[PDB]
Amino acid sequence: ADVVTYENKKGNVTFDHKAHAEKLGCDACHEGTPAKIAIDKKSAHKDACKTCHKSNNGPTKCGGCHIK
Ligand code: HEC
Ligand code: HEC
Ligand code: HEC
């Protein structure tokens, strides 16, 4: 899709898949080939979502992703 969300317990995490794609390229997330990714709590918080954004914008605590 162009937008997805992980409907997680906290507050659903929107991700403008398309946006990230056209803004960045593809490489950004899908090096070899896309076959899903399945970015969970661990991945997301560790080194996927909540690593990239550091140098781009400052979501300090939360809210950045979880719409809650
Ligand atoms: C990181 C911010 C991403 C960018 C940039 C792109 N994609 Fe992506 N993609 C990403 C995630 C986290 C997911 C998985 C969602 C899940 O359910 O696990 C995906 C998924 C895809 C898929 C699979 C869709 C499906 O029906 O399962 C495809 C085919 C895909 N992505 C392709 C794709 C392309 C072509 C992009 C660059 C041009 C692109 N993605 C960017 C994360 C990210
Ligand atoms: C984007 C950079 C994020 C920010 C900002 C925060 N979180 Fe997050 N979180 C994110 C994703 C993509 C996911 C995936 C959902 C999953 O469970 O795999 C998560 C997940 C969590 C979870 C687990 C929720 C569940 O349903 O089990 C927790 C407990 C969580 N996140 C907490 C949390 C808090 C407290 C934040 C501020 C400190 C926060 N998240 C920010 C993406 C992002
Ligand atoms: C680094 C290449 C990125 C990865 C990997 C992820 N995101 Fe991202 N995100 C990135 C940028 C450059 C931006 C800002 C775009 C702009 O126009 O300036 C964003 C923005 C978001 C947003 C909005 C946050 C805001 O500042 O308003 C969301 C909701 C978001 N990103 C979610 C998200 C998730 C959950 C990711 C892991 C699956 C993720 N992003 C990865 C760059 C990058």
Curated annotation (Swiss-Prot):
Gene Ontology molecular functions: electron transfer activity; heme binding; metal ion binding
Ligand binding (heme 2): 20, 49, 52-53
Protein's UniProt keywords contain Transmembrane: no
Keywords noted in UniProt: Electron transport, Heme, Iron, Metal-binding, Sulfate respiration, Transport
Post-translational modification: Binds 3 heme groups per subunit.
Binding site residues for heme 1: 17, 26, 29-30
Residues reported to bind heme 3: 45, 62, 65-66
UniProt keyword Transcription regulation present: no
An annotated GO BP: anaerobic respiration
Stated role: Participates in sulfate respiration coupled with phosphorylation by transferring electrons from the enzyme dehydrogenase to ferredoxin.
Protein name: Cytochrome c3
